Subunit: 247 residues, 4 copies
């Protein structure tokens, strides 16, 4: 196996996942960059170029995490290259903006579409990685799963009620996974508030007590911290939302 | 419209729903008894007989709440009979026992099967009832939606990880519904722990600080209380679990 | 001992405690009406007259709950009269409005003054009642302690930061008491939002999603429900705040 | 003012505070090492020697944080030396082991003794530092207050019920401070579980899902992370308890 630790990142073509691949690359880790499909591949290739410039060994895998076979194939590709997985950051996700009071404009199709990526896909990726995650834990150090949830899962706001529901499920799923994968693997979730992937900006900033929005790099820092420097933290949902929970 | 208030209960053929139909019947309300299918109809008919003996006007409707048309037809039947809905108690649900650490024995099919009843079906029933629920609210009194969630949604335990995830989604969905249906409709969830529908009993009792299990009637009392006597309570998840959350 | 159950209410001269004494009186219980001092005695006597009109046996006791001897003497008076205690409702409390951002206008004196009534006094009253509470539990039914906390304890708002802190302590204290007095005694807290004891009204109503304020009788109903109809509920903080937690 | 950022640490003579002073020293910050009294001074001097070896400018101050004048004098000493405060880590605290079910072995004296250090003292230190904390914030970066609370504040366990209550108050106080000091100062709390300051060890490890105890350095890492790398995090209580909350 490789003598350098390995991080697997789904949703790695953009946003939080892209920023997280870069942060692990800056730490010297090898990064498995999870690309969605042909529409995201150019972005993924730029992420890979930046991670290599940061000094990391890289590989790109395609996976629709809603398909269990795609999750298994992705882990097989990582296993063949480095024979270890030290962290999995589940950033793959989807939504569609639908007002929560427009009951007539959402349907079961959309509840399932969002749940398939955000919850089932997140579980399937984690399950596929568990054997290597457990094997890569040492006598003294546990490995790390980080689930990107949302403030929406905590308080029922967000882009749609189907999105909020799926993130509430992610929060609870994180608890089960933490309980059942202890002591070798720690499992935590992150609950970002407003994130600017680069008027709308000035409206998000004023409503927040901290009078700012988050950039993806901050969420990457939290994923890195939970992985590298938090051996006692498991089963938590960490909210990084610029004070919105305070009102 | 009818001069007597109306309660609609899904999952009313057995367990908590059956007990809740009876409790509303004892209060003098008319009850719309939600039966699942032919396999549950005999139980539903017994529930109806008991509610009529308690003095309530009754009707039985069939509905697979996972089918939106079934939810709409059910509300149409209630509207035609009494032209009002004053409370909806979402007790329809499903699960299958699968150990949370048997990762190889659950699949996406089961995650979707459970979510379809517990979350999508609960939303679809609530949405179908919202017009009448809002119309039945008065200048002084809001109507009531009660969602039967589970301790599993709070802490990630329970019959399966797919069940726990679906109940975490119910908890978050309850928040969105409460926020967006205020002020005319209050929306709350209940989180029962161990419930005996009538060794296994002695194992549940010893692990609980209160050294007992719940019977369905207690959960019905809570649903009735939240509906009839709690005009300030909305967006809450009330845990009735015999102290299990204390350890 | 008396064949009628007994409720002890501190803070019973006014507000929530007065309403709670009345609600237990309406249920047929004997009520021990906890009066503060000479300044509240006339109000307490009116509460007693109303409880007797409701048909309840009554007694009035004076107690400054911050003084442990006053708590012990009060329980001795109740023991001598009826030789049982079936519920204790801790409504004694104090505060003073000080803006949370006026750091220069609160001091350690006020933190201690509020904590002495709201937390120490609540503990001392509960401790004094525990022997009779445990003895009055039956083979099938636990007795009940209800602590009146506040929304302020949940989210750090409220009349002052010293008040909010004291109510956060009440919430945690409720957990310890519930864990350690199980299975014979259940211990729960209530977290009211805006309560009108009878412009200010229209400002409270508009900010609440439910577009109303609470009256003391609603909080009394919750204390009665938790005592009489909730054998599985212990260690909970029930928020009745007209939706303010939703934003 | 100094061109190097400044961290003020109470409770800095030992345990988490000592480890936190060292971690900030390793980051290049100047550290104000808060010593309690003559009994802790030798330990504080060793902490200072280690921080200087790590390359940090240092000063030691004495303060009984329960005395407001001691908090003001301490901040005056820091202001005179460096004219800035960029972070305050409130680690001063006290307790005494008393079983939560030994109601007869705790008194109001002990509730006040613990509250005076853990809550009033923490507030008084924070208040004294607020002017410099706000002035040291920049147009782009907020300063940081980190309160060392406890798992006991979350679930009512811990060394005594008076300790648990005081930490529940710390949790709520953290919310008020975060809300009212935004946007210039972020305020967060840490909730450690079992911490070994160096049979008892093997009993703590087995009960934890992560099968370990924490060492003070891990809590220092969390305090450092929240200060240096978490511009969106405020009003949170971060639990680092080796999975104990999972059961
Ligand atoms: N079914 C899927 N399988 C894998 N990746 C997916 C799937 N659906 C969406 N994604 C990817 O997940 C990522 C979502 O991240 P993004 O939409 O950029 O916002 P944030 O950084 O706030 O999550 C994108 O790269 C998207 O292409
Ligand atoms: N898809 C569905 N649509 C409507 N009702 C359903 C559906 N699936 C299951 N149910 C019903 O929901 C109820 C679940 O309640 P029960 O299984 O008796 O346990 P508890 O009382 O603890 O909920 C049953 O009546 C079941 O038949
Ligand atoms: N130290 C004390 N001991 C006993 N009762 C007290 C003490 N301090 C205040 N009280 C009483 O507690 C009650 C507080 O209730 P109230 O102030 O009317 O508002 P709410 O009904 O919202 O609690 C009052 O009767 C007050 O006199
Ligand atoms: N009143 C006080 N004022 C200032 N510091 C105090 C006060 N009381 C206790 N302390 C200090 O607070 C620190 C508590 O930390 P410690 O007892 O070593 O355990 P942990 O590292 O788990 O907090 C000690 O240095 C103690 O001397």
């Amino acid at each position: 196996q490789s003598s350098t630790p390995v991080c697997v990142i789904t949703g790695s073509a953009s946003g939080i996942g892209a920023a997280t691949a870069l942060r692990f690359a800056q730490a010297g880790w090898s990064v498995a960059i999870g690309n969605f499909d042909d529409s995201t591949r150019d972005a993924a290739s730029t992420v890979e170029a930046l991670c290599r410039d940061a000094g990391a060994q890289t590989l790109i895998f395609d996976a629709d995490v809603g398909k269990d076979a795609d999750c298994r194939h992705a882990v097989d590709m990582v296993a063949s290259r480095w024979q270890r997985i030290d962290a999995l950051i589940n950033c793959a996700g989807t939504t569609r903006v639908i007002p929560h009071n427009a009951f007539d404009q959402i349907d079961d199709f959309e509840f399932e579409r969002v749940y398939r990526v955000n919850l089932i896909g997140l579980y399937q990726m984690t399950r596929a990685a568990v054997p290597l995650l457990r094997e890569s834990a040492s006598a003294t150090r546990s490995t790390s799963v980080v689930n990107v949830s949302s403030l929406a899962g905590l308080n029922g706001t967000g882009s749609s009620i189907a999105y909020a529901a799926s993130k509430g499920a992610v929060n609870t799923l994180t608890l089960s996974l933490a309980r059942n994968l202890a002591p070798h693997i720690r499992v935590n979730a992150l609950a970002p508030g407003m994130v600017d992937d680069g008027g709308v900006l000035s409206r998000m900033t004023e409503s927040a007590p901290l009078k700012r929005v988050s950039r993806p790099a901050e969420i990457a820092e939290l994923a890195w911290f939970l992985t590298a420097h938090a051996p006692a933290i498991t089963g938590q949902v960490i909210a990084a939302e610029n004070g919105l929970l305070l009102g």
